[PDB]
Design a protein around this ligand. Structure first.
Ligand SMILES: Nc1cc(C(=O)N[C@@H]2c3ccccc3-c3c(-c4nc5ccncc5[nH]4)cccc32)ccn1
Length: 207
C-alpha cells in the first residue's frame, strides 16, 4: 500500500465539505450516480468503434448496495473504470482545477449542491462518509483500491478482492449519524427525486 499527500486545494475542499454546516446532504447520491453514468457513457462510446472494449463485460448498469452491519453504502457501476495513473495523477489534476473553480464560485454565492458542475462531485461523498474506498478496474490496467479518510492523505494498492471485470465501486463508510442512507425507503426517495432519468438501469439492492 502506497500513501500519497493531497495537494493544498483539494485538501481544503475536503475540510470544507466535512466542517461546513449544510443539511442538504442527500445530493451526494445524485453526484455519484452521475459520475457512474458518465463513466458508462465513456466505455459505451468507445465500444462503438471497438466492440472488444466490452469483452470485460457487456452489461452497462449501476447498483446501489446498502449494508447495515458494515454501515456502508456502495455505488457500483460497470463503466470505464480508472487506471493507476487516473487514480494518482490524472484525477489529481482534475481535482485541483475543479476545486479552484468551485471555491471561487462558493465565495461568490454558489451553493455546495452545485459541486458537480465543477467535476469534483465525487467529494460530496464526504458529506455522509468518514472514509471512502474506491475499487476500480479499467481495461488497460489491473484492479486497484484507492482510499481516504481525509486528514491530508490517500492510499492506493492493488486490490485482491473479488475480480470486477470492469468498472468502479465507491464504498461509503457512513458517519454514525448518517445511517438513514442505508434504508430502502430513503434511497428510493433520493433516486426518484434526483436520478430518475439516468440512461442506465439503477438497481437498489435490499437486505
Ligand atoms: N471513471 C470513474 C470515475 C469515478 C469517480 O468518481 N472518480 C473520482 C474523482 C472525480 C473527480 C476528481 C477526482 C476523483 C477521484 C480520485 C482522486 N482524487 C484525487 C485528488 C488528488 N490526487 C489524486 C486523486 N485521485 C480517486 C478515486 C476516485 C475519484 C466513478 C466512476 N468511474
Amino acid at each position: 500500500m502506497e500513501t500519497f499527500a493531497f495537494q493544498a486545494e483539494i485538501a481544503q475542499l475536503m475540510s470544507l465539505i466535512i466542517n461546513t454546516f449544510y443539511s442538504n446532504k442527500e445530493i451526494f447520491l445524485r453526484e455519484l450516480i452521475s459520475n457512474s453514468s458518465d463513466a458508462l457513457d465513456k466505455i459505451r462510446y468507445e465500444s462503438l468503434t471497438d466492440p472488444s472494449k466490452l469483452d470485460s463485460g457487456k452489461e452497462l448498469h449501476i447498483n446501489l448496495i446498502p449494508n447495515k452491519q458494515d454501515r456502508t453504502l456502495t455505488i457500483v457501476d460497470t463503466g470505464i473504470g480508472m487506471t493507476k495513473a487516473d487514480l494518482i495523477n490524472n484525477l489529481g489534476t482534475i481535482a485541483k482545477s475543479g476545486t479552484k473553480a468551485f471555491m471561487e464560485a462558493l465565495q461568490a454565492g454558489a451553493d455546495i449542491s452545485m459541486i458537480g458542475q465543477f467535476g469534483v462531485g465525487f467529494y460530496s461523498a464526504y458529506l455522509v462518509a468518514e472514509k471512502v474506498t474506491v475499487i476500480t478496474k479499467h481495461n488497460d490496467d489491473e484492479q486497484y483500491a484507492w482510499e481516504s479518510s481525509a486528514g491530508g492523505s490517500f492510499t492506493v494498492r492493488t486490490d485482491t478482492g473479488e475480480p470486477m471485470g470492469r468498472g468502479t465501486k465507491v464504498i461509503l463508510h457512513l458517519k454514525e449519524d448518517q445511517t438513514e442512507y442505508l434504508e430502502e425507503r430513503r434511497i428510493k426517495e433520493i433516486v426518484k427525486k434526483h436520478s430518475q432519468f439516468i440512461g442506465y438501469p439503477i438497481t437498489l439492492f435490499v437486505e
